[PDB]
Design an enzyme around this catalytic site. Structure first.
Site: not given
Length: 216
Positions: A13, A36, A39
């Site tokens: 990812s 992050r 994500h």
């Protein structure tokens, strides 16, 4: 912590995010935080609205290392932080959004529980050198601005990522104005505009805790 298949999914990812995010102006460490956030939301827009103060990551790490208090506006944020990693430093988390006194004070003072929640943390000196994590309520961020401006409070870091359509955008801009006028140099991490969320806040905290560990 996580399985092999787990890591493989995450690694795959992050690789997809890096390749798709394209060109950006974030330094490596800063990028670990922004990546992050994208994500946790699958929203690349955060690549453009997340603003990180130069000393943000540094003050953040230092504060955690010291077992500083972590003041959260909403309970969900805490529910995302694993106490295991926090005991390593001894950090103590707090969220008074649901306390009786806070509820009654909000009602009685014609304000919000978020605002009284922040005032309560202050009544306990929990804002000094702490990490203020506001992942939802814009009024909580405006109050922090108010306390910095009028009370001179000095948190180690402000994670201002409230989401909303009424004062979210404004609450974040008020933090940038403090810096704009050099009234203070409190480090911050903001997602400008109306976008934010407890999940964005948790993702930022986890990026910090990771960066902290990686610095070893």
């Amino acid at each position: 912590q996580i399985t092999n298949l787990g890591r493989n999914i995450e690694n795959k990812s992050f690789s997809i995010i890096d390749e798709e995010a394209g060109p950006h102006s974030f330094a490596q460490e800063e990028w670990e935080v922004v990546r992050r956030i994208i994500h946790a939301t699958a929203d690349f827009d955060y690549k453009n609205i997340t603003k990180i103060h130069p000393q943000a990551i540094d003050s953040g790490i230092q504060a955690l290392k010291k077992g500083c208090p972590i003041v959260c506006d909403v309970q969900m944020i805490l529910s995302g932080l694993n106490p295991e990693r926090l005991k390593v430093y001894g950090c103590k988390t707090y969220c008074f959004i649901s306390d009786e006194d806070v509820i009654e004070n909000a009602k009685r003072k014609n304000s919000t529980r978020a605002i009284e929640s922040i005032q309560k943390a202050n009544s306990f000196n929990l804002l000094n050198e702490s990490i203020i994590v506001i992942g939802n309520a814009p009024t909580a961020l405006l109050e922090i601005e108010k306390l910095i401006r009028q009370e001179g409070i000095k948190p180690a870091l402000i994670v201002g990522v409230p989401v909303g359509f009424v004062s979210a955008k404004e609450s974040k801009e008020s933090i940038l104005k403090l810096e704009y006028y050099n009234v203070t140099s409190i480090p911050y991490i903001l997602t400008m505009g109306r976008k934010g969320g407890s999940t964005i806040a948790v993702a930022i905290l986890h990026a910090l805790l990771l960066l902290s560990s990686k610095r070893g």
